[PDB]
């Protein structure tokens, strides 16, 4: 529901 | 046990395209993202696309930028990479990768490659 | 774009031997919020996946003796196997994993003497 980037 | 099977491997035809799969299992897919990386014949690792575990975030190098398209169908735990414009270069074999959302520590899991030949 | 270059391309080695491999960063690997240096370290044999064996620069992943060591920092770092054994013999990529895009070396192919 929360969507999260790529940490690179 | 995490396992990740790719499929679509063909060869093909410059400037043709292609669309591969990866089957997730053993974990949570839709909590992580995926990546894609491929293995040219000169043996060297070049990553190719990665995708967010939700999907609205999608991340390639230049040198597939505006042809391969990263996608993900999460209700069915499977992982795609569509392939337009294919050239000879794009020859290798192509895995499939979990993204350690969690771990930040590079790719423990990959699939057992589905080899893209494009034809010279 | 992040440049790794891995040295030297191969070695043979006999059994026990130390073995010593280079993987340099053109740039820092130092991450922003941790400062643990995003360098993963893979082994490869052939018709398989390369697989993870130290994160991190220097952290060992599961089932990896200590004859391996990973070590330095930023931009210079070190794979050492204190004594080479033949499930050894593979080829050992370096990966940029801490910024887009994800780069790696060109492998550090170890082989048996004839």
């Known amino acids: 529901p929360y969507d999260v980037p790529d940490y690179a | 046990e995490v396992k990740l099977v790719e499929s679509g491997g063909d060869l093909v035809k410059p400037g043709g395209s292609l669309k591969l799969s990866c089957a997730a299992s053993?974990?949570?897919?839709?909590?992580?993202?995926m990546s894609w990386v491929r293995q040219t014949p000169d043996k060297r690792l070049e990553w190719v696309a990665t995708?967010?575990?939700?999907?609205?975030?999608?991340y390639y190098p230049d040198s597939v930028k505006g042809r391969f398209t990263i996608s993900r169908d999460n209700a069915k735990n499977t992982l795609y990479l569509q392939m337009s414009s294919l050239k000879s270069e794009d020859t290798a074999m192509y895995y499939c990768?979990?993204?350690?959302?969690?771990?930040?520590?590079?790719?423990?899991?990959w699939g057992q490659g589905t080899t893209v030949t494009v034809c010279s | 774009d992040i440049e790794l270059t891995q040295s030297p391309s191969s070695l043979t080695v006999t059994a026990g031997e130390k073995v010593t491999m280079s993987c340099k960063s053109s740039?820092?690997?130092?991450?922003?919020?941790?400062?643990?240096?995003?360098l993963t370290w893979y082994q490869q044999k052939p018709g398989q996946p390369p697989k993870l064996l130290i994160y991190?620069?220097?952290t060992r992943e599961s089932g990896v003796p200590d004859r391996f060591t990973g070590s330095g920092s930023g931009r210079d770092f070190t794979l050492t196997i204190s004594s080479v054994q033949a499930e050894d013999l593979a080829v050992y990529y370096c990966?940029?994993?801490?910024?887009?895009?994800?780069?790696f070396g060109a492998g550090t192919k170890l082989e048996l003497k004839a």
């Open positions: 990768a979990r993204r350690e959302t969690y771990d930040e520590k590079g790719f423990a899991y």
């Open positions: 053993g974990f949570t897919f839709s909590s992580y993202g």
């Open positions: 995708i967010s575990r939700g999907g609205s975030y999608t």
């Open positions: 740039q820092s690997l130092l991450n922003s919020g941790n400062q643990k240096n995003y």
């Open positions: 991190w620069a220097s």
């Open positions: 990966q940029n994993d801490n910024s887009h895009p994800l780069t």
